[PDB]
Design a protein around this nucleic acid. Sequence first.
RNA 1: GAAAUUGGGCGCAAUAGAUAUAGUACCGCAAGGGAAAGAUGAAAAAUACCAAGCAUAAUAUAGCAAGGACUAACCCCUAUACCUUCUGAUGAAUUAACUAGAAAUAACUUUGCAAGGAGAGCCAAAGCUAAGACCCCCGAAACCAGACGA
RNA 2: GCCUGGUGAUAGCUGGUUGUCCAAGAUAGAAUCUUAGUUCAACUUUAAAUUUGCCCACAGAACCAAAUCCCCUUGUAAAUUUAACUGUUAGUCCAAAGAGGAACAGCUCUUUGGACACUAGGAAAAAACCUUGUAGAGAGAGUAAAAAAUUUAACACCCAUAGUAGGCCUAAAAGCAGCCACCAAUUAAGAAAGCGUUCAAGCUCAACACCUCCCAAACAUAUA
RNA 3: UCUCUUACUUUUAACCAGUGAAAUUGACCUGCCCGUGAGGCGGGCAUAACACAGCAAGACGAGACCCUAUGGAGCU
RNA 4: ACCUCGGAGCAGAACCCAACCUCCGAGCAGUACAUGCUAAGACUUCACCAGUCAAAGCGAACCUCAAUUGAUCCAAUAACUUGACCAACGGAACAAGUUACCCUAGGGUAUCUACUUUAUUCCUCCCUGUACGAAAGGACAAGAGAAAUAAGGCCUACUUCACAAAGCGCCUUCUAAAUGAUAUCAUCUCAACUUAAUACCCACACCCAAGAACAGGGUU
Lengths: 85, 79, 120, 157
Amino acid sequence: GGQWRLQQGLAANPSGYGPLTELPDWSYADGRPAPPMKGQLRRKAERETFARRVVLLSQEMDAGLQAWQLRQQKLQEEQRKQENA
Amino acid sequence: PRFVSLRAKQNMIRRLEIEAENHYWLSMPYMTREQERGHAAVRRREAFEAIKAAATSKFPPHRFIADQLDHLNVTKKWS
Amino acid sequence: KFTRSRIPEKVFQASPEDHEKYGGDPQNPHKLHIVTRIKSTRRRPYWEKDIIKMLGLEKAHTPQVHKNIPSVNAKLKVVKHLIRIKPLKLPQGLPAEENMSNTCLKSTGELVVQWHLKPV
Amino acid sequence: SKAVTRHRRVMHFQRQKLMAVTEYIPPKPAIHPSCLPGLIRLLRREIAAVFQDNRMIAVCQNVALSAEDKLLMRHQLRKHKILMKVFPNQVLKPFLEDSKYQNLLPLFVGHNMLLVSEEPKVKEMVRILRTVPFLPLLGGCIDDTILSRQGFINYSK
RNA sequence: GAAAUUGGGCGCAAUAGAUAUAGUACCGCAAGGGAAAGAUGAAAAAUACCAAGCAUAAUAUAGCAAGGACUAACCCCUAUACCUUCUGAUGAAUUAACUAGAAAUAACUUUGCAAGGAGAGCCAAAGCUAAGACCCCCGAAACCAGACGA
RNA sequence: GCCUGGUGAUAGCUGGUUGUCCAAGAUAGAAUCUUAGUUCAACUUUAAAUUUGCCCACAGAACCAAAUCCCCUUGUAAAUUUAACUGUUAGUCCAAAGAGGAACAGCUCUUUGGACACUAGGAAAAAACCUUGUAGAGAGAGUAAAAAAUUUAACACCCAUAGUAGGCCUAAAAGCAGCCACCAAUUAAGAAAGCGUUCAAGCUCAACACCUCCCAAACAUAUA
RNA sequence: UCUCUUACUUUUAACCAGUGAAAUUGACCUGCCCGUGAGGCGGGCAUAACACAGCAAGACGAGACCCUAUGGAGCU
RNA sequence: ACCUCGGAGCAGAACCCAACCUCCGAGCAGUACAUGCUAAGACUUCACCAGUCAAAGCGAACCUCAAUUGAUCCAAUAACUUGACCAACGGAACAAGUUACCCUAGGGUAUCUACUUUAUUCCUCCCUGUACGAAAGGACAAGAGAAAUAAGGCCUACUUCACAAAGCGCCUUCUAAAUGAUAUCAUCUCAACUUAAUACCCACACCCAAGAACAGGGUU
Ligand SMILES: [Mg+2]
Ligand SMILES: [Mg+2]
Ligand SMILES: [Mg+2]
Ligand SMILES: [Mg+2]
Ligand SMILES: [Mg+2]
Ligand SMILES: [Mg+2]
Ligand SMILES: [Mg+2]
Ligand SMILES: [Mg+2]
Ligand SMILES: [Mg+2]
Ligand SMILES: [Mg+2]
Ligand SMILES: [Mg+2]
Ligand SMILES: [Mg+2]
Ligand SMILES: [Mg+2]
Ligand SMILES: [Mg+2]
Ligand SMILES: [Mg+2]
Ligand SMILES: [Mg+2]
Ligand SMILES: [Mg+2]
Ligand SMILES: [Mg+2]
Ligand SMILES: [Mg+2]
């Protein structure tokens, strides 16, 4: 029953993101935290490269529009500075 | 002869609904085609110069004295 | 003969009814798409197989970020029956280098830049 | 098999699923709509002129005869200036209330024929009706006074 | 396809190796074809365990004979034999043994030496020398020569 | 004839080709005493060198439909060249455009694209339809495709005189053997729409007055 | 011969005793109906196990006919 | 009937695309004699072979057509050149019919399952020559017969024969009404109501009407 979980903003599969799969399964009995799970390290690597891609594409879009606005402003300056003499 | 159940119609329909929303989100680009031009030419060129560079840097590995002599250890014995 | 299909432009023009249906604004549109393959490239022509490989959607049910520019939209229009597209919405900002590791893309379509595992 | 065949060709299964999904759906209202809410003036002028004409009127159930028998009755009453009139009671029920005949509203239904008159040969008409053991005299009305059949015996006598 | 000219075993060991214990037995009128097989020990003047096939020990609803299993052999569930030939009939009772990829022109890899290489001959506008690394088994009807046969 | 030899004759044909594990890998054709085969190409494989390949936007490609070519951006990561060779080819079916045939064939021949000769799930079984691909263990989870729906046909009760047996043709054919007009009376029944008679006479209609042995078992009620 | 077959004798047979083959054979724990494309696959049904004698519906098993080989041989 | 080459359709818009598919054609002719010589760059019949186009240059003036064709070797020739309906048109330097005599290599004594004791018809006669019809005509049903076949037995006779088995012999064979709604009449009602398998079988040894063996029956 995962369409319900999509209604609530959860992962459609309870083995997705969230507290069942991302907290560590075990600790030491002293209370020392375990070394991290292999799948959680892998998964954090995937999420980080995804975030880097979001930032990278966003910045290329913004730099793209700024460079276009310089080309338009300099076209208009080349219009007004050639209507003289 | 094969006939169409309610499962098949409801499945077909939910695919049609995903499709219609794909039509919606493709109807409003962030840039025009004039604005996007060359906005990523540098990164594409550097990426291909990396592909090109890994292609043209292919050569036999270094050979070492220590490996060849290290084969002598197959008759290491005790005393 | 089975050929490659052009799709007319009236198909990709939203109506205000559709702005009431989905959550979109025609002014100030979204920058990034999330694309997911939800259908197989098997039994599909080789050109659609290729476009799926270019967009980086070889694995199904795995989201991919794209730009909402007309080039990427052209490739998406070719394989729009195999994928799902949602806008990448960002409730907080795009992640800085401090919040780069601690992110999570939720199911809603939003990308949260502080992902604790505590209840609110 | 060609694209045009003599029999209806079997569709591909996704063709058939498209055809089933895109069937016509008719609109359904919340409430069913069915569960929601010249000759005439010729008879009015003609028979309304017959109202002002007659001083005396009578009527019978003149359906119980043959064609030549109604010809005999037509000639034997042609011997008088009485007139016989086969006309629908459908229009005659508003005729009576127009002519202020409240005692005559319960009179005119079923098969009937008018015997409008100014001179009573109606005793001799009874003399014609006594030889035929049927076709009774239905009550009339001389000058806004009703005639029962007993009144037809009294007045006709 | 010339010439001048030049100058004991990285074998086999009884289906192997000889056909060979023998050109015997056997087959054929004849020319001719042509086998198989033995295993003690110093002394015979000292008489284990292992192929298929069976037996000990026949069988129990159901089905390419198994697999998942299971407290439990079966019962439950899943499961269209293998090879080869076709886009998708052939051959095999079973066991043992025997039975089928042979060539280094050129290229490549690794050494040596290097405007030279090679233990004459040959190649050489980085070559030449050396090595490594590539090329199956069975099966006709026939044709010809010489014998042996009425 | 038969034997020995040439002789391990030859066979584009049949049959067969023996450890392990991984990887890459399938459908244009041209010639040929050729269509049971070969050669070249195409495709495939390894190694090497380099630099673009693929997707594509405007513009552009002729007179007498679906699309394609071309193609910067962009999204990607491949491509070409050099060296060395093997192997594969009547493919089959489905969708589409067609040709031949019977708008027959599990029929024949082209084109475009899938799928199959590679996995698994579904469709009863199931090469080719649908879902789905990259490989291991798990007594975890979310999904994809995915279950055939239908059941029929009542009908108006009456009410019918008269110019007239409408003229002409026709033995007579009268509303009904044919032509023409098709007016008219009462309140209203056509110079007639079906039976019917040689012809008639008789019956209805419109209109008047009331209005080899079937093949899951089954089940219509609990919230998707 | 047949309508239309019957009886008997011998042989064969079957049982007992001795002796003791062969073609065949992927493995078999070897059912029916319908369906598919049929002992084995699907849906139904059936179903303790085991010899002996029969039967011959099925399983499993030459002679033709056509084509091909840059295959032969013979005849005119 | 065909075998090579070209045009058009198939194959509508870059190129390509088959068929013993649909239609046309070709195997030359004419003019010129710079139809000389050279040479960047290209196209190309899906390979190769062949094919095509060509600026600049030197030298001079001041080709049309679509196809219109043939490799190598060999010949002929002083040389330049020339040589095939080699049309089976990528062409072997020169070789026919036939084989039902053809030949070879290829292509298209019961093991298992299953099984081995689940009353019809004709003619006659009667009812009846009645019913029904009106005369001609003419029933059914049920009954008696005689036959025949099939099924199951049996031997008293007959016959083949003879402690018995047989047949040619005998025996037995069991949907239609009323009523009636929808639609107050009616209406056969995919309206409701009412009305029109028994039998069979069942607990050593010797002889046997039981029997292949086993089994079975009898042995007082
Ligand atoms: Mg020997
Ligand atoms: Mg053993
Ligand atoms: Mg089972
Ligand atoms: Mg093998
Ligand atoms: Mg002699
Ligand atoms: Mg050979
Ligand atoms: Mg050959
Ligand atoms: Mg692989
Ligand atoms: Mg030839
Ligand atoms: Mg061949
Ligand atoms: Mg370009
Ligand atoms: Mg014996
Ligand atoms: Mg069958
Ligand atoms: Mg079988
Ligand atoms: Mg038996
Ligand atoms: Mg030959
Ligand atoms: Mg070419
Ligand atoms: Mg030829
Ligand atoms: Mg030729």
